[PDB]
Structure formats: structure tokens, C-alpha cells
Amino acid sequence: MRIVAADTGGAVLDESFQPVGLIATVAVLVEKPYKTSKRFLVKYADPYNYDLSGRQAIRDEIELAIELAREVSPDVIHLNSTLGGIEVRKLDESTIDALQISDRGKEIWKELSKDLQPLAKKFWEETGIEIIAIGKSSVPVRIAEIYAGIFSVKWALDNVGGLLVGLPRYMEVEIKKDKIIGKSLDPREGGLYGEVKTEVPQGIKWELYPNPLVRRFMVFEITSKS
Amino acid sequence: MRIVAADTGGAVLDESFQPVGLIATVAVLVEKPYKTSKRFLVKYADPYNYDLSGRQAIRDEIELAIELAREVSPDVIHLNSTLGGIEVRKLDESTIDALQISDRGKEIWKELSKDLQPLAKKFWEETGIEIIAIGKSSVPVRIAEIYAGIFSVKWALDNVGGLLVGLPRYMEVEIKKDKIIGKSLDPREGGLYGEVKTEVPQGIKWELYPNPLVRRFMVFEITS
Amino acid sequence: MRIVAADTGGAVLDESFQPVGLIATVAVLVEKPYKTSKRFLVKYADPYNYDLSGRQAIRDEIELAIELAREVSPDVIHLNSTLGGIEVRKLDESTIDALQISDRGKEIWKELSKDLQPLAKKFWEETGIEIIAIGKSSVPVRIAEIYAGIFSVKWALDNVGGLLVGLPRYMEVEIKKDKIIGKSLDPREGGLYGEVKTEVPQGIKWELYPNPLVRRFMVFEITSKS
DNA sequence: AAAA
DNA sequence: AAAA
DNA sequence: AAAA
């Protein structure tokens, strides 16, 4: 099967490792063997003017996903929200309460459905393609998340005297002359990876290391040789 | 310590990666250093006539484990159900209510005890060996699960014009000229593996890749 | 950031892999890149006269961390307890009930607070350093745990006709000629490790293998050649 | 629910 | 809450 | 509870 998925991830961190704002929203097309993506879109946010409790991320995710989906016509869209695979077009207050989720999760999504449910309904009317909230269960979602990490590092390289990027969960990045590679650190996932072309700037040093306050998350730090 | 454990696993999947039915029930003997098994039994189900919500799996498991136990006389039997290590022979509705599990889990075992508890009682009487529901905690149970995976692939090799097999959680298989090797993909488990001798047919291609719908589960695909 | 963390870990096991008692309490200093510690303290317990239930451990940990902290003046102390990051000086009957932890945990810490809360208060008054119950989230706590493992093996080597050591969760140890190395087995953690100097006695053999009754925990076993 |  |  |  052919799947379009999206995720928002990558954060600017302050010096005590507290998130300031998110960076990259990515939509990816994933096909067999479901390890990477060769066709994807990115939209950068402004992390210094970001509402971390604003939940603009998922609105960005579905729009980018639909934009990619219109170009490549997948079998399904995977949205990063763990609701058990329920179709977003079937999302009303009735079906939300029946979900096996937290009370906070139910109230976040009753408010979100007001824009997203009509969006998904119209896209389905147009194409027959469902938008499903599968979240943690989805491999395409994890691949989008890996790419959000890569594009965040690409963003950091392009916008740096010092920057701390908090990567999405247990992934690493590698810097090469003409590209950035991102890989899951979890071998249980079966070797998920991504790769993006970019020019790596001069006069900067970088390091990748564990976030001391959030175990299994890495930090990518850029410093100027100044 | 010498342990017999059992598990059912491996599923035939349709073209949209949905499970059709389970394949292999395996009982293993596990001994020090507790990384693999050299002595085991397999039972094949019919995945095309299987009730996934039917729980013949756990019934198959205890029977097979008992069959193996009678032959190799272990210290204990491990059953793949996470109930905190309570003896199956001591499982009645009284002790079931006290178990710290979901009510769905409670209603499942109220039904199961009716058959299994007398069996465990009878088996304990004969041998002194306990049958304990330990599940996720047991390394022998995970080694059986890995073997279930290997045997599912063997099943795939024996019945292939094209098949998709969903393996148990995060394990890989490698096919060599005369055998199938299965390994946990989780280095935290400390290097669990299994190996089965089988004849590999000619004229086939196979591939192993992530189930796109079930993260950390792999798919084994084989074509003629 | 500079962090002091502490943990109690390592157990003597009987022949059927049941824990008899714990071995090592360690405080560690962790600095960038937050993968290991080069400065640490250990206190060994008597595993054969130990009350597993319990809580002499946390008392030892906070004492040991304060002792290390006085020497190295960290930014914060992490105690191995997952309470959401609440300062131990702020632990009273009111705030303990507000914690999203089990009813068992709440009644336990109302008892612990009577000794620990004044201790953290006095230390904060003196230095401005908070002692926080962060637990599972802290990389420094995980590094302390690894060191607890290493020191537990050192203890076994120094006190061994046969010993079984149950290590902390998913870590391995390597014996070298003049030292013991400990490593996390989880690559998602980003390569956490430790190293402790010791003399390896003669006339003994060792093996590392899975604890069959506790999945993802390893056993370090020592046997005499006599 | 999501984020580091 | 912690421990193997 | 188990299965992918």
C-alpha cells in the first residue's frame, strides 16, 4: 500500500533544555518496504513565535498531508494522533467520548474536530481517501517524525551564534557534505531512516548528545567557532 | 533452572496487512544461559479457519507445554499470560477477582479456569511441577514466541503462490540453505534467538520488512 | 548544566533468581555530553541483612547526593523517584495528595517526608540547590543506576565460592584487567556508560546472561575455579 | 490527544 | 514510589 | 488477558 503521513517535530531548546517552539512540519509518502520516504514536503514554523499549547501543529499536519496526497494519491493518510485509527471525517462528540483515550484527549479533539472534521469530510468526498488518527501504531507516522528531525537540523544549520535543537524521540542525525541523514535509534522499528539534501555551512561546529532531562531524546547543538 | 514455556504466534495477513489467523504453537525447553532452546515442539493451526477472539491459543499452549514437560521433566512451566506468576492450579473465581488485571481479562479467565485449572491440578499431582501464568516477565516465554515466529516462516516455506506472514513483536528471520534463524530485534533482551532445521524449496523469493500499520512488528513475505 | 544524581541498585540473587538484598548506593556528577560520570561516590549495603521493603535506599541516596553536591556544587540534584519533578523541600501532606501517583506511593512519601523534607529544606537554604524527584525521565539518574550496577559487580568480585548478581535493568558489564565497564543495552538512550577501577581477583570465572524470571534484566554470575 |  |  |  501507499501511505501519506505527517508529523510536526523538532524544537528550539533554551540553555536549560526547555522547549521554546517547534520547527518542522513534514508530509511524507511511504511505500514498500516502508523504511523511508523519497517524496515529501516540509513547512517551517517560527519557533520563537510558537504556541506549544496552541496545537497548531496538527492543523499544519493535516493540511500538508492533504497537499501531498493530492499530488500522489495514496490509499490512506496517517495523522499523528493515537485514537485507534478512527477516521477524522467520522469525528464528532458522539464518537470521541467512545474513544479509549484520556479526558484531556477527548476535550482537545472535540474542539479540533470543528475545522478538521469538515476538512477530512470534503477531502473524502473528493477522493475516497480516509484521514485516520492512528498515531504511535503507524510506521509512516514514525518516518515523517524522523524527517521532521532532519529538517529541524537543516533549519538550524541555515539559521544559526549557537542553537539547541531538541530532536523527536530516540533518533540520531548524521551530517555529510551535501546531505543530512536521520535514523531511528530503536532497532525494534526495523531500520527506519530518512535523507535530505542540503549545503552544510562553514564556521560552525555541531554535537549530538542525550537530553539530560528527557531520557531517550537527543539534542543537536550548533556552536559558532566565533 | 530448567523451564518449559509455550506460546502461539505468527499470523497470515491479507493484502492490507490485516491478520487472518494464527499459525504456530510452540513449546520449548530453556536452560542456562537462557538465550535459546535446543529442545522444542510445534503445533500448526489452520490460519484460514481460525477465531482470533477464540482463545484456543492458550489452550493449545498449556497442552503442548505439558506434553513437552512429561518428556523432559522441567522445574516449572511458564504460560504466556501476564497474571503475576500465580499458579494455574490455584486459579478460581476468588483468586481471579483479586488479580490486578482488567475486567475483560477477568471475565476471560473465569471462563478459562473451568478447563485449565483442573488440568494444572492433575498435572501438579502427577509430577509436582507448577504451571504459572507469568507472560511478559518470562524469558522462556519470549524464546517460545521467537520460535513461534520461526515455525510460522517454516509453515510459509511449506505452503507457498504467495504469502504474507506477520511475525511476533520485533523479531527478524534469516533463511539459510538448510535452516531458519530467528533473533529478537531488542538488544535489551540480551540476545535471544532460535534456530530450526528445514529444507528450503527452490524457485522462491522472500523479503522481510516493517508492517506499516503495526510499528515494531515485521512482515515476512514469500513469492513463487 | 551540571547535575548530581543518586541510585541504589544491584542485588544478590539466590539459586532461583530471587533477590536477597541490594548492594550499591551511588551518587554521580553528570556534565555535558551527559553520557557518563567521571566523579562519583559509593556506599555498599549488607545485602544479607537488608530490608527490601524497604526505603532505607532513598535515605542513603539523598544523603550521598548531598555529600557529593557539597564538593562539586551542581545546578540541581536528581533523586531516583518519579514524582513529576517536585522539589523534596516542598513535600507536605497537601502536595503529596495532589501527585498523580498510586495511593500506595502517596502514603509512603508522607512517611518519608518527615525526614527528607527538612533535609532538602536545610540544603536549599544553604545553597539554593533543589533536590528533585524526577526518576525515569532523568539521564543522570540512569547513569547512577549504571554505576550502581558496576559497583555491585565490583563488590561481588571483592566478596566472592559463588555469587549471582542481578544487575539493574538492561545493562551489561565488561571485565577488563584493571577496570569494570558498564553500558546501557538500550541504544535509544544514546550510549550511556560507566567505568570503575578495580583489581580483578584470580581463581574465579564469570558469565553474563539473561535473568530467566525477569525479562530485560541480566545476571552476572561468578564461580570459583576451586 | 500532541511536544522535548 | 522503589527493587530484580 | 492474547494476537498483528
UniProtKB/TrEMBL annotation, chain B:
A GO molecular-function descriptor: metal ion binding
TM spans (from-to): none
Binding positions for Mg(2+) 3 per the UniProt entry: 7, 145
Top-rank lineage group of the source organism: Archaea
Positions that bind Mg(2+) 2: 7, 80
Ranges in a coiled coil: none
Positions annotated to bind Mg(2+) 1: 7, 61, 80
Gene3D superfamilies to which the protein is assigned, alphabetical: Protein of unknown function DUF4152
Record keywords, A-Z: Exonuclease, Hydrolase, Metal-binding, Nuclease
Protein name (record): 3-5 exonuclease PhoExo I
Source species of the chain: Pyrococcus horikoshii
